[PDB]
Amino acid sequence: AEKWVSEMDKIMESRDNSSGLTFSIAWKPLTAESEQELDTKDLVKLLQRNSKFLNEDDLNRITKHFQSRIGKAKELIQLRNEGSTLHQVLKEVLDYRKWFTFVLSFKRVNEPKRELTNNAFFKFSGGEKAMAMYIPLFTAAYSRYKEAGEMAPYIISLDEAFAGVDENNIRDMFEVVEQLGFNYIMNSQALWGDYDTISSLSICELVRPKNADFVTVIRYQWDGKQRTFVVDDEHVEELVTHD
């Protein structure tokens, strides 16, 4: 997970975004609720500790920490009357995603880095909001693929594509998706994909009014400037002949 976030941050820093803004993300360990336990931060430090520097003493400490965590699991079983099996309590105590937290950060031009809390986000303009929301997701889905081979097609699937982005700025989101080089299947109620940043795109329109049992597909095409219809070569021949 740390390697994934590191690659994601490297990619987010290694570009320039049309909104005049740059983002960076980090995955940091949290502090435990109280000192009435072996603080989870110590255990996380030991786990992240480089293998080269590991030693029998650190191994003993880690084993001790895990023993304490399992003792806490049994204690929680007894204290929580929910009657949940020990398996659930273990899966909860040892779930590492709870130990770490994400922290998004943005850096306006020639200004200090800041953490992106909700309140700060709302002060943003529309394009800034869209960039901040849809760069981390796209950059994550792009970082995952970097683990993959060179044959892999970078696929994504967006549902209710970009709903919320002010109608004017969707252009920039499509610009970003174009730059990264994704192949995607996106669906929308009003999106037409006639934005000049889209080099080429295929639009299909579905129609079945309320209860009809057949879906009618009206296949369009796009080339960056105009949206023609599509008539398939074999289907052109058949239509000419079928009259």
Binding site: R80, N81, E82, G83, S84, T85, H87, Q88
Partner: protein, 384 residues
Amino acid sequence: QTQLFDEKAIQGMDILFHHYWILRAEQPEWYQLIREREKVLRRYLDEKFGLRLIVHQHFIKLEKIPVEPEGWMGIQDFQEPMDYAIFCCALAFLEGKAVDEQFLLSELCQEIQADYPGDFPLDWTLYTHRKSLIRAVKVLMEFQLIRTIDGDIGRFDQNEEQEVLYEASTYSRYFMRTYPDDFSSYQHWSELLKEDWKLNQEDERRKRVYRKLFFSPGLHRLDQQDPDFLYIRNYRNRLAEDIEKHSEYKLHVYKNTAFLSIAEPRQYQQVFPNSKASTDIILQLSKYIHGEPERFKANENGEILMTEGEFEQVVDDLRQQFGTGWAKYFRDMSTKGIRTELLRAMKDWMMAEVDSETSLIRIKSLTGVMTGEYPSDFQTGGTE
């Protein structure tokens, strides 16, 4: 942080009902699902039904004790009392074997023969006795009470010399529930029920109604003053709301019957209608009864009374009209055989009763819930 009855709890309740028990070694997903909500399930079952949910290391089991036993409830793979006798004797034998102990089929046959309590000895030279033993062993193996070290029991049908090596599995210990007193002091099964309900004096009526609803396909009005049906009438709305909240079912109420319907039955469930051909004739008979209200005017209790002759005449009329579309199994069989088969089917679903004394047929109001017909285009096809 507290538990709530949710999708997982509903799923667990259905799994508990529609199986005898859930084994960890074979149903780990279901066992895990049931256990997590086991607190809520125990609370709900105790408050409303009164059933004892047994949660153990190796299995989870809901001791489904019925309000009034009905034919369909019993182990269906068995067809004669002798099969039940051999099953019980085999269990008694397994009590003598330690866990994972291995015994040969011949030893089991010998012990069953020795213990078999009837006046008439159990003999293996016959075909029928061997078939009964094979059915008993198959049901045993179904519950994983005994595992099979390689061999073949099916050959026992036609080769009494067949041999097999069996293994007593741990579940044999826990199969049968516990009984109140020294169980031997009891003289007839009816005495068991009087005990199992001696523990549920508190709100016996609500548990009674819930058990009848959830277990039986339907709940028939005994008479004009049946207390269970009066209870349901008084609390129709909250009963429906609670049942919808806690399970997939939805309650129905009529003047002479009440039952739970299910909208989307999952794979493991049993429901009516189904594939078996006898249901088709049941639906057709229901429609035929709907079509002559004056001739088959139901009495006040919702029953329709017909004698074997009248029922056979009705079945003949059905064979005349819709018989062209019946399954070839019934199309080739005489009227009386069809009457017997149809009446067995309708008995299983508590659709009708055969009067013990007068041989009079009582068709219960539950039959009229559903009616079926062929598509009109085939019926016109049947005319051609």
